[PDB]
Amino acid sequence: LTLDNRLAEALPLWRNLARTDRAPRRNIDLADWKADWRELIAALDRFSRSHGYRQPFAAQGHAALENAWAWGQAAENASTLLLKAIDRGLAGAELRSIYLETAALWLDYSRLLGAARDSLREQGETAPALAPRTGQYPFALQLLAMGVLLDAQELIPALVEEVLQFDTDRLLDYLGAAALGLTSASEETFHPRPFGQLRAFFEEADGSDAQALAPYLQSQYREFFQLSPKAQKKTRRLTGPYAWGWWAMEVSALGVLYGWDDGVLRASPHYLGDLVDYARARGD
Amino acid sequence: LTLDNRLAEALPLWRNLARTDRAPRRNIDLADWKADWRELIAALDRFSRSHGYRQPFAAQGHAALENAWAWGQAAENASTLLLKAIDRGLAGAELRSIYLETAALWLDYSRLLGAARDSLREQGTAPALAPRTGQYPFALQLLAMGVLLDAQELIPALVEEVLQFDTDRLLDYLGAAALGLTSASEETFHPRPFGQLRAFFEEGSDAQALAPYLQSQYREFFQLSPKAQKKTRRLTGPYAWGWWAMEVSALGVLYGWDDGVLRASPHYLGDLVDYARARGD
Amino acid sequence: LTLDNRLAEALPLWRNLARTDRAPRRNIDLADWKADWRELIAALDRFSRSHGYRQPFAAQGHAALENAWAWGQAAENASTLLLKAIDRGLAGAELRSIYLETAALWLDYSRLLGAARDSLREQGETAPALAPRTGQYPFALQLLAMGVLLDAQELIPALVEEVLQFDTDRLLDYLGAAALGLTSASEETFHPRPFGQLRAFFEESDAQALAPYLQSQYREFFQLSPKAQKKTRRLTGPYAWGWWAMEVSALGVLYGWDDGVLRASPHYLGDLVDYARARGD
């Protein structure tokens, strides 16, 4: 099978990104952040030195499937690395350098997972590599929204086909629409809290006003993260501390896609205005 | 089938414990401690994110067996996390929350191990903890910390499922109240140090009978160089038991004696004796 | 099968080495070094507590092969721990005790690999444990060169036979020549950059023969940005070999010449040349 990741080459470059002079995008503890960074880099470095990474075609049947799961865990760790890099204030170009490998690892995972399931079938369970109907949704949100925000949308079609197996809902369809050439979107919302609150924007919204998303940012991000952690956990809002975290990635990516004057949204500590700017400038 | 741990829920809360206002229970290097803490949390988090934790029933035959061993290592990690929290000075309530998951992970491990062995038969021998071996300290932690954290409701299940009833005299005395035991094993699985409890057990009460034991088996052992400690026959358990006279401390809870003579020992957990007594009411 | 490593005994000693009074052998960041050291120690500790390490003969067939791979990664981790200890300035005696365990883990890895491959072919990849023709060469270089530099050449014949399965090139044959004899030393060079630049030395007594090699293949290479380094296509081995001209230093010990012109290099291990010489006698 063709594998696209170049993780071993990327790691020494990433390891060096902790040395940045950029300001974080939100209030973080820098000591904690650096230790978190080192842990994720060490996990991915360990994975890169494993037999299952270096010789992924040596196993067959259930052994192949167990190796695929190890790759899937690595893909999650690369998503968390990307998230930590966003928190830290790494600029668009640096984030894109991570995103290309995060996307590649997810795609490679799905291909090895497919190949294992084929091997098992030909020897005589079924969910996609990333099943957005489940709690995994934030990784799919990250893959599509960060694709848009980092001007890497050309990876979205294979991601949607191979990783998600086209099991996308309304928001994911909007995020990937330009990339895939979608003419219609799903009517479903897999996780109505918070994403059902986008219903007004999708159905009644002109796309000529970012104001349509300002109440969404206030209520689903600012007011949510203002609650105690204990209270947050009692609500039904989906959270994704491994890929999505603090960031209104969906609203920010919609700004790139719609091209509107997003000034009203930049007041939000959860909006990624600098990445909106990056994606627009890079696109041109 | 029913797994009792709630590890994914617990981890974020265990992170915040490193932020405590408490003083350590013994002399520790706080930078080294925080680093050991982060390491164990990271390991447990990686386990909570693994396919074998998230889909524990997906594997069969030898694959199920290998997954059970990963759960086994996570249960050991939770025991070490509990030890590190005791060293750090975390109060009874916080320790109890860690213990509940530690015990749950040991039970879940034993149940998955058993299920794996059944799968292996359905296609087409050692218990989760074998106290006769060097794994005794984990069994000592599970029983003694169950007593010291007023969580004795776990002890019967742990004895039956994790230990498969392979207990010696000390383990029997620790579990006596919970099991409705009216007698105890005559055996001692690790005479060094536990054989030195004989004078106490064969007279049963009086905290005084435990004072020499704390002196000779704890203070005078840990005063030796690390190199000299290793040349002695004394059992050690750096992953679950460490510095702490958990057995003596648990006996203070079970017997209810005035433990003043024992509290002078830096190895005695007097604050947890008080916690367990107060919580037992 | 018999296993030579004593990894569980060595670990507590190794974490102790961070407490050294020695100065580093090159400019390093001590905070970064300590975190790297803790990481390797943690990985080796986790491996030492794994079912695959504790019960290595339990798994059969493909499970035995997967277990062997885990031993292979532990061996690599022990090689990286050795390299970090060289950077840190740990003296010859301390490096020697790490090296013995490193070599033992590589040998144990190779034995388990062979046994798994035997289990499979009796149940109805062929590459050696370390294939020096590939990017694995730096681990082979470390094993033979540090064998010489730490006066532990008694390990060389086993390592060449079991770990390399005799797949050695000219430099490796030169490094093992005292231990194994120099009949036909290979004419091959597996990695022309940097090792083809030893051709003059091998074909044409005087340490000056290796002086340009150190400037050109070491001083001039490590002067470059990481980006410029990658463009040269020189083999590197950040997991075992790193900054160190281990080949040149070991040849110092083998040939016995006055290495004065070589100690001018920040990449030369003169204190270890001295150590192996003194210990050899």
Q: Is A50 on the interface with C (CB under 8 A)?
A: yes
Question: How far apart, in Å, are the Cα atoms of A226 and each of A15, A28, A238, A246?
Answer: 33, 15, 16, 11
Q: Which residues 19-48 in chain A show a CB within 8 A of chain C? A: 38, 42, 46
Decide if A128 contacts A165 (C-beta within 8 A). yes
Three-point CA angle A225, A191, A104, nearest 5°: 90
Interchain pair C73, A63: CB under 8 A:
no
Chain A contact set for B46 (CB, 8 A): 43, 73
List CB contacts (< 8 A) between B62 and chain C. 59, 63
**Three-state SS for B272?**
helix
Determine how many CB atoms are found less than 10 A away from the CB of residue A284: 5
Task: Give the Å distances, CA to CA, from A117 to A28, A112, A157.
Answer: 42, 9, 22
Q: Is B76's CB within 8 Å of C38's CB? A: no
Q: Nearest CA of chain C to the CA of B74: how many Å?
A: 10
Identify all chain A residues contacting C125, using CB atoms and an 8 Å cutoff: 55, 58
What b-and-e string marks burial along C220-233, b requiring 16 or more CB atoms within 10 Å of the CB? ebeeeeeeeeeeee
Q: Which residue of A has its CA nearest to C69?
A: A51
To the nearest whole Å, the CA of A69 is away from the closest chain B CA by: 6
Q: Does A62 touch chain C (CB under 8 A)?
A: no
Q: Which residues of C touch B230 (CB under 8 A)?
A: 9
Cα–Cα distances in angstroms (integers) from residue B160 to residues A185, B127, B151, in the given order: 56, 10, 16
- The DSSP 8-state label assigned to residue B215 in this structure reads I
What's chain B's length in residues? 281
Cα separation, A64 vs C62, in Å, equals 11
Chain C residue with minimum CA distance to B231: C9
| 8 A C-beta contact, residue A211 and residue A268 | no
Containing H/E element for B231? Answer: helix B226-231
* Cβ-contact A140, A164 below 8 angstroms: yes
Distance in angstroms (rounded) separating the CA atoms of residues A221 and A230: 16
Of the partner residues A42, A51, A58, the one whose CB lies closest to the CB of residue C72:
A51
Q: How far is CA B259 from CA A58, B95, B263, C122, C150, in A?
A: 62, 22, 6, 63, 55
Q: Which of B38, B49, B59 sits opposite A73 (nearest CB)?
A: B49
Using CB atoms, which residue from C9, C49, C59 is nearest to B76?
C49
Smallest CA–CA distance, residue B42 to chain A, in Å, is 8
**Which residue in C49, C55, C67 has the most chain B C-beta atoms within 10 A of its own C-beta, making it the best mutation to test that interface?**
C49
Distance CA B170, CA B197 (A): 8
Looking from the CA of C206 toward its CB, the CA atoms found within 13 Å total 7
Nearest residue to C33 via CA among C74, C77, C85, C75:
C85
For residue C12, list chain B residues with Cβ-Cβ distance below 8 A: 226, 238
Q: Contact, A74 vs A80, CB < 8 A?
A: no
Instruction: Residues B125-281: name the CATH superfamily.
Output: PA2201 C-terminal domain-like (1.10.3920.10)
Select from B33, B36, B38, B39 the residue whose CB has the most chain C CBs within 10 Å, as the one to mutate to test that interface. B39
Cis previous bond, C194, omega within 30: yes
Q: Is B51 on the interface with A (CB under 8 A)?
A: yes
Which pair of tokens denotes residue C160?
């060449």
Distance (Å, whole) CA A15 – CA B113: 39
φ/ψ of residue A93, rounded to 5:
-60, -40
Q: How many CA atoms lie within 13 A of C89 on its CB side?
A: 15
Residue C266, token pair as written in the block: 């920040």
CATH architecture for segment(s) A126-284:
Orthogonal Bundle (1.10)
Burial of C183 (0-12, 13-18, 19+ CB in 10 A): exposed
Cα–Cα dist B237/B250, whole Å:
17
Q: Whose CA is closest to C44, among C18, C19, C9, C68?
A: C9
Spacing of C-alpha B255 from chain mean position:
20
How far apart (Å, rounded) are the C-alpha atoms in residues B94 and B82? 10
Report CB contact under 8 Å: B73, C46.
yes
How near does any CA of chain C get to the CA of A185, in Å? Answer: 45
Contacts of A119 in chain C (CB under 8 A): none
The dotted CATH code for C1-125 is: 1.20.1440.70
CB atoms B73 and C51 under 8 Å:
yes
State the nearest Cα–Cα gap between C149 and chain B, in angstroms: 27
* Residue C66 with chain A: CB contacts under 8 Å: 51, 63
Helical segments of A50-169, H only: 51-54, 61-88, 92-122, 137-149, 156-158
Alpha helices in chain C (DSSP H): 7-16, 30-48, 51-54, 61-88, 92-122, 137-149, 156-158, 170-180, 192-195, 199-203, 211-214, 220-222, 226-232, 246-255, 270-280
Rounded CA-CA distance C121/C207 in Å is 50
Report d(CA A39, CA A46) in Å as an integer. Answer: 10
For B18, the closest chain A residue by CA position comes to A32
Chains with ≥3 CB–CB distances under 8 Å to C: A, B
**Residue positions counted in chain C:** 281
Tell me the chain A residues in contact with residue B59 when contact means C-beta distances shorter than 8 Å.
Answer: 62
Interface A–B counts its CB contacts (< 8 A) at: 21
* B225 backbone dihedrals φ, ψ, rounded to 5°: -55, 155
* Expt. technique: X-ray
Residue recorded with tokens 């579990």: B175
Domains B1-124 and B125-281 equal at CATH topology level: no
Taking each helix axis as running N to C, give the angle between helix C270-280 and helix C137-149, from 0 to 180 degrees, rounded to the nearest 10: 50
3-class SS of residue B238: coil
What one-character DSSP code corresponds to residue A50? S
Distance from CA of A47 to the nearest CA of C (A): 10
What's domain B1-124's architecture? Up-down Bundle (1.20)
B231: chain C residues, CB-CB within 8 Å: none
The answer to whether A229 contacts B12, with C-beta atoms less than 8 Å apart, is yes
Query: Which of C179, B46, A229, B88 is closest to A237 using CA atoms?
Result: A229
DSSP-derived letter for residue C184 is S
Backbone angles phi, psi at A73, to 5 degrees: -65, -40
Residues A224, A232 contacting (CB under 8 angstroms): yes
Closest CB to A63: pick one of C43, C66, C72.
C66
- C42 contacts on B by Cβ (under 8 Å): 39
DSSP state of C239: T
Chains that touch A (3 or more CB pairs under 8 A): B, C
CATH 1.10.3920.10 fits C126-281, yes or no: yes
Number of H-type helices and E-type strands within chain B: 16, 0
Report resolution in angstroms.
1.9
Residue-range domain boundaries for chain A: 1-125, 126-284
- Minimum-distance CB partner of B63 among A66, A73, A229: A66
Report the gap between the CA of A272 and the closest CA in chain C (Å): 31
Quote the DSSP letter at residue A3. Answer: -
Quote the tokens at residue B162. 């994790």
- How deeply is B182 buried, as exposed, middle or buried, from its count of CB atoms within 10 A (0-12, 13-18, 19+)? exposed
Does A125 touch chain B if contact means CB atoms closer than 8 Å? yes
Q: How far A176 CA sits from the closest chain B CA (Å)?
A: 27
- Residues in A closer than 8 angstroms to C69, CB to CB, are 50-52
On whether any CB of chain C is under 8 Å from the CB of B62, the answer is: yes
Cβ contacts of C63 on chain B, cutoff 8 Å: 62, 66
Would you state the structure tokens that stand for residue A278, as one six-digit string? 């990056």
